[PDB]
Design a protein around this ligand. Structure first.
Ligand SMILES: [Zn+2]
Ligand SMILES: [Zn+2]
Ligand SMILES: [Zn+2]
Lengths: 267, 175
């Protein structure tokens, strides 16, 4: 089992990470419980319990954009599941890799998951639009999954792993990502109305608000967010993070300041 | 600033009144010895690096910074690190507190004054070393005005064009 759960598929994912990516939250739970058992069974080895566990859950050298705790939060439904073919004021993206050129578009969630790794750009046309991605492509955000299992899995991850401390692929700490999500949903969901084409007329997602409320109760998440931009909590991206190649004088100046742009943008 | 240097500079004039690598042949020369600086030693540093102009001759421009061409170089020893005004003022006062913490014998011709307070010894080269960029920037922006003071220290930061301003006057006078 340890080998089978630490083995990586053609996209680098363990079976656990695959269960999360596919919204099979009860399977992810089953495996995650089992992975803790396995790591706790091999305590007789000269490895630390954690190394094995992290190997099975989120292996070393994983691209941060695929870290499970982040992926679980990205797994929302396409707006179309609750707006249907009605036009609401929302953010929209073109996706040139897919021929979704400037007349066409997808909503934020499709751009984040259905078009992950493509050329996508924030579009400049009017925001009053539905999302073409369910019609033009094999849209992976149409399925909600089991909401109660999604929330249970989140709780478990927050206490099982240190993943809350990582920034995503744009330097956003998880909290700064969640609070922007809630602020965006607040505007989009207020446009919702009760009553070959995909299932529409579903109720909008409240997961980001629930997740934000729970994460904010974790000391580690909060400390990790507030200390962001300190010399210890070195932001990997867009933030003077490579310095050793400059001559020593400029280092002794440039080490002295500390960052707050993200902490201020959050607050 | 220009006036307060004048005072210390005058005081300093009252104060002053081999096959070694130290032999004058090996020492850095005109244009090369930066303000209050000590050489990047040419026997330890590559020629390519010691003099980017001697490395690349076409690098000379009329308005290039001298720092490029010859290679980039207690109250004065610690650099201006803090940006805040207030902390610098407070530190200045604390440093000042560190230093705080007929005539029989000499006739006037034997008077030995100096500047000794605020620092234990100030010589203007040190200060030209400390505020180097502010000075160079003043040495472009304020030259027409603060440079009109008699013997204004800004003209010593005068590049090519200052010398050329004298050149036309002298050559046309000779013509
Ligand atoms: Zn969509
Ligand atoms: Zn989609
Ligand atoms: Zn795409």
């Amino acid at each position: 089992l340890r080998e089978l759960l630490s083995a990586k598929d053609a996209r680098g994912m363990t079976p656990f990470m695959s269960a999360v990516s596919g919204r099979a939250y009860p399977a992810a739970i089953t495996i995650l419980e089992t992975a803790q058992k396995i790591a706790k069974a091999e305590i007789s080895s000269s490895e630390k319990e954690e190394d094995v566990f992290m190997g099975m859950v989120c292996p070393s050298g994983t691209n941060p954009d695929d870290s499970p705790l982040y992926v679980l939060c990205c797994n929302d439904t396409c707006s179309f599941t609750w707006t249907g073919a009605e036009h609401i004021n929302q953010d929209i993206f073109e996706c040139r890799t897919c021929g979704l050129l400037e007349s066409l578009c997808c909503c934020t969630e499709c751009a984040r998951v259905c078009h992950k790794g493509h050329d996508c750009k924030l579009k400049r046309t009017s925001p009053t639009a539905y999302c073409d991605c369910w019609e033009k492509c094999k849209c992976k955000t149409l399925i909600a999954g089991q909401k109660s299992a999604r929330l249970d899995l989140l709780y478990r991850l927050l206490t099982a792993t240190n993943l809350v401390t990582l920034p995503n692929s744009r330097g956003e700490h998880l909290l700064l990502f969640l609070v922007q999500t809630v602020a965006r949903q607040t505007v989009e969901h207020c446009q919702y109305r009760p009553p070959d084409m995909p299932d529409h007329d579903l109720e909008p997602p409240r997961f980001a608000q629930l997740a934000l409320e729970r994460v904010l109760q974790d000391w580690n998440a909060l400390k990790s967010m507030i200390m962001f931009g300190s010399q210890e909590n070195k932001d990997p991206l867009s933030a003077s993070s490579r310095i050793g190649h400059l001559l020593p004088e400029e280092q002794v100046y440039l080490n002295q300041q500390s960052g707050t742009i993200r902490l201020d943008c959050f607050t | 600033f220009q006036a307060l240097i004048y005072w210390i500079k005058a005081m300093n004039q009252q104060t002053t009144l081999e096959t070694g690598q130290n032999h004058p042949f090996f020492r850095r020369s005109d244009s090369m010895t930066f303000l209050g600086c000590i050489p990047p030693n040419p026997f330890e540093v590559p020629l390519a690096e010691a003099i980017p102009l001697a490395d690349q001759p076409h690098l000379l421009q009329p308005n290039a910074r001298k720092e490029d061409l010859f290679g980039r170089p207690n109250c004065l020893e610690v650099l201006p690190t803090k940006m805040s005004y207030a902390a610098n003022l407070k530190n200045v006062m604390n440093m000042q507190n560190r230093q705080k913490k007929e005539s029989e014998g000499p006739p006037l011709t034997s008077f030995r004054p100096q500047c000794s307070f605020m620092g234990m010894v100030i010589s203007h080269d040190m200060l030209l070393g400390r505020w180097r960029l502010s000075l160079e920037l003043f040495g472009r922006v304020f030259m027409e005005d603060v440079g009109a003071e008699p013997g204004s220290i800004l003209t010593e930061l005068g590049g090519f064009e200052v010398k050329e301003s004298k050149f036309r006057r002298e050559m046309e006078k000779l013509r």
